[PDB]
Design a protein around this ligand. Sequence first.
Ligand SMILES: Nc1ncnc2c1ncn2[C@@H]1O[C@H](COP(=O)(O)CP(=O)(O)OP(=O)(O)O)[C@@H](O)[C@H]1O
Ligand SMILES: Nc1ncnc2c1ncn2[C@@H]1O[C@H](COP(=O)(O)CP(=O)(O)OP(=O)(O)O)[C@@H](O)[C@H]1O
Ligand SMILES: Nc1ncnc2c1ncn2[C@@H]1O[C@H](COP(=O)(O)CP(=O)(O)OP(=O)(O)O)[C@@H](O)[C@H]1O
Ligand SMILES: Nc1ncnc2c1ncn2[C@@H]1O[C@H](COP(=O)(O)CP(=O)(O)OP(=O)(O)O)[C@@H](O)[C@H]1O
Ligand SMILES: [Mg+2]
Ligand SMILES: [Mg+2]
Ligand SMILES: [Mg+2]
Ligand SMILES: [Mg+2]
Lengths: 195, 182, 180, 186
Amino acid sequence: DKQWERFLVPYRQAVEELKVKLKGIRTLYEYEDDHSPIEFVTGRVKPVASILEKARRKSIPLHEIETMQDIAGLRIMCQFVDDIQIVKEMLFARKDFTVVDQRDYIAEHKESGYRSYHLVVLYPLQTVSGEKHVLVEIQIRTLAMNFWATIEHSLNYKYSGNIPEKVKLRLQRASEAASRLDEEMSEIRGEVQEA
Amino acid sequence: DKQWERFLVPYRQAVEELKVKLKGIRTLYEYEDDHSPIEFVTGRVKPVASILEKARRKSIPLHEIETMQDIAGLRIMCQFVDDIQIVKEMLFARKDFTVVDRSYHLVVLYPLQTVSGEKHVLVEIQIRTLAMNFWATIEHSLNYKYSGNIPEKVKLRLQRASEAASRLDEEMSEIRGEVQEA
Amino acid sequence: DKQWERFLVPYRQAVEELKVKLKGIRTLYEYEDHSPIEFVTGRVKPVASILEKARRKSIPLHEIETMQDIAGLRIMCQFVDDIQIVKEMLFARKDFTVVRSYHLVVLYPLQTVSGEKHVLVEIQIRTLAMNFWATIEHSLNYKYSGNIPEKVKLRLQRASEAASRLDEEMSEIRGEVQEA
Amino acid sequence: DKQWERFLVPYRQAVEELKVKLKGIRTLYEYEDDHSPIEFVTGRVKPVASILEKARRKSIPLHEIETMQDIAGLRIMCQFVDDIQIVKEMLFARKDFTVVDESGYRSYHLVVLYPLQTVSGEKHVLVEIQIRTLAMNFWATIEHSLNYKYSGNIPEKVKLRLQRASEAASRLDEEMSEIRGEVQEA
Ligand SMILES: Nc1ncnc2c1ncn2[C@@H]1O[C@H](COP(=O)(O)CP(=O)(O)OP(=O)(O)O)[C@@H](O)[C@H]1O
Ligand SMILES: Nc1ncnc2c1ncn2[C@@H]1O[C@H](COP(=O)(O)CP(=O)(O)OP(=O)(O)O)[C@@H](O)[C@H]1O
Ligand SMILES: Nc1ncnc2c1ncn2[C@@H]1O[C@H](COP(=O)(O)CP(=O)(O)OP(=O)(O)O)[C@@H](O)[C@H]1O
Ligand SMILES: Nc1ncnc2c1ncn2[C@@H]1O[C@H](COP(=O)(O)CP(=O)(O)OP(=O)(O)O)[C@@H](O)[C@H]1O
Ligand SMILES: [Mg+2]
Ligand SMILES: [Mg+2]
Ligand SMILES: [Mg+2]
Ligand SMILES: [Mg+2]
C-alpha cells in the first residue's frame, strides 16, 4: 500500500510526457488556422482500488499487473467523428512509441456508434535505471460522447453499479441525444468541405 | 504593436487571478463527493485585432476602449443547466470583486493590486453548459471561415446542431431531476 | 483524518491564489526594470508537521487554525535591498491584511462556497543565496532527525557564512552599478 | 516575421517535452527519499533578436541558422558540483535523443539532437543543455544582466565587484561540497 505509490511512479511520468506530446498536436494546428483534430487532452493514473478490482475480474495474477493495459491512460477529445481516424493515423505514424495490437472493447466501440475508440501503445520511458517500457491506453472520443460517458460514470459510482430503473432510462435517452448531436455536427463538417 | 502589450498587462493578470479563483470552486467540491456546479474554466485576453474591430461597430472612440467590457474574459462551463444558476448566485455573493449593473454573462469590476497601487479592471464572466459551448464554438469558427456570411446549407445544419445541443441538455436536466428523486 | 483533506482545502486554495498574485509582480516588471522578485513558491504544511508543531508549541486540535504557517509562500530575491521593496509592496496591498531573510503573516480573505473565510498565511522573503543554504539546513535537520552531528553542523555554519558573504558581494555590485 | 513565428514552432515544442522528461528525474528521486541531482529545470526559446545578433557575430548564413545549436536551450540546476557529472551521465545514458559534438568545472554544456514527432512526420532538432550549480548560475545571471545592460563593455569599477562576487560564489560551492561530503559518511 506504500509499495503501490512506488510502483506507479513510472506510470505518472509516462502520462505527464504523452500528455505534453499529444497536446503539441493542437498547438501545431493552431498555426495553420486549419481545424485542429484535437480539442483537448487529459490523462490519469488508474487508482489502486480500480487496479485490484480489474485484476480480480480479468483473472490477472498479482505478479503480472504490468500486463494491464490502462494503468496509464490518456484521453484525446475531438469535435468530429471523422477527426478520430485522423488522430488514429497520427498516432500510428509517430515514432516515440509503438502501437500494441489488441482487440478489446469491441462491443463498447460499437454500442457507442463508434464515437468512442482506443488503442494501446508501448512507451519507452527513460529511467534512472535505464529504459522501462510501459503500456499506455489512449482513448479517442467525441466531445459529445465524452459528455455522456462522464455522466454514466458518475451515477454508476453513485449507485455503485445499481442504477435505478427510472434513472437508467433517462440515461439511455441522454445517450441518443448525444449520438444525435454528433450526427448533426458530422453533417456540418460535411457541408463545409463542400467548398 | 507593442505599446499594446503594455495596455493589456493588467488584463492578463486579472484573467490569471480569476482563473485560479474560480477553478477553486470545483476544488472545494471534490472532497464532498457532492456535485461540482463548475466543470471547467477558461479565459482569454481580447485579441488586439478584435478590440479595434469591435471599437468600430459599437462606435467606441479609441480614448474610451477601457469601457469595452470584454478585454478580459473568463468562461465557466457547467454540466447542467441548473448549475449556471448556482454559479451565478455564487458570483453575486463574492466579495473579492463586485458585479457591475443555458448561457449567461455578467461583468465584474476586479480590484487589481498593482505595483503602482490599485486598479479596477472590467472582466466579463460567461456561464455555459458543455453542450451549449460545443455548439457555440463551431458557430464562432464558421462565422470566421465564411467571414460573417455563412452559406445557407451550412446555416441550417448549424440550426439543427443548435437544437440537438438543447435536447442533450434537456435530457441531462431530467437525469439530474430524477436522480434527486432519492 | 479524511478531515485533514477537507480541512486543508481552503489553505491550498489560498496558497494557489497568492501564488498567482505574487508571481504577477515579476511579470509587471519584466515588461516595464529590475524585478525585486526572482521566483515564488508555496506549500501547504503537510499533516505530519502540523501535528508535530502542535505538540511542540502545545496547541490542541481545536486551535490549529492558529498555526501561522499551514499555508506558506516563499518569495526569493537577488539583492538584500530587494527584500525591503517586497516588504513594502506586501504591506501596501489590500487583497489582504498583515497581522537576507524575513517573514510576515497575512490574513487572506478566501471566498468559500458557503461565505468568506479568513485563513492565516505566512509569507517568507529571502535572498537566493540565503534560501539555498536554508534548504540544506532543513534537509539535513530532517535526515538527522533534529540532532545534526557536529562534524556536519560546523560545515553548515560555513556554508551559512559563505552565502552571507556572496550577498555582501552582490550588494556591492548593485552599489557600483548605481553610480551612473 | 511570422516566417520566424512558424519556424520556432518545433523548437518551442521540443523545449516543452524535454522540460517534462527532465522534471521526472527530480520526481523519481524525491520519492525514493534519496538526494536529487537536479534542483530544477528551466528552458528558453532564443528570442528572434538574439538569433539575428548571434547571426552576424559568428559569421552565420541566415539560410543555415538551423545549424545554430542553442535556438532551443535547456538549463539544469544542481545543488552540488558533484551532481553535475551525475546528471551529465544520466544524460548520456538516455535513448530518446542522441548526444552530439573561466567558471571552471562548475558549469558544463552539451548539445542533443531531439527526434521531434510532428504532424508531417519526424524533425530532428538541436537543443542545448547547460548544467550549472545553483551558485554558478546565480553569478552568471547578474553577469549576463550587466554584460547586456552595458552592451558588452562593463565599467572597470563593476567588473571588479563582479570578479569578487564570482569568487564568493565559488567559495560557496566549496563549502557545499564539503557538506555533501561529511554526509556521504553515513
Ligand atoms: N484513458 C483515460 N483517460 C482519462 N481518464 C480516464 C481514462 N481511463 C479512465 N479514466 C478515468 O479513470 C477512472 C477509473 O477507471 P476506468 O474508467 O474504468 C478506465 P478502463 O480500463 O477503460 O475501464 P475499466 O477499469 O473497467 O477497465 C474514471 O474516472 C475514468 O473517467
Ligand atoms: N468571456 C470569454 N471567455 C473565454 N473565451 C472567450 C470569451 N469571449 C470570447 N472568447 C473566445 O475568444 C475568441 C475570440 O475572441 P473575440 O472574438 O475577440 C471575443 P467575442 O466572443 O467575439 O466578443 P465580441 O463579439 O464582442 O467581439 C473565441 O475563441 C471566443 O470563443
Ligand atoms: N512559506 C513557507 N513557509 C514554511 N515552509 C515553507 C514555505 N514555502 C516552502 N516551505 C517548505 O515546506 C517544507 C515543509 O517543511 P515543514 O514540515 O512545514 C517545517 P517548517 O514550517 O519550515 O518549520 P516549522 O514547523 O518550525 O514552522 C520545507 O522544506 C519548507 O522550507
Ligand atoms: N540553455 C539555456 N537554458 C535556459 N536559459 C537560457 C539558455 N541559454 C540562454 N538562456 C537564457 O536566455 C536569456 C537570453 O539568452 P540569449 O542571449 O538570447 C542566447 P545566449 O546563450 O545567452 O547567448 P549566446 O548567443 O552566446 O549563445 C538569458 O536569460 C539566458 O540566461
Ligand atoms: Mg481502460
Ligand atoms: Mg465578448
Ligand atoms: Mg515554519
Ligand atoms: Mg548560450
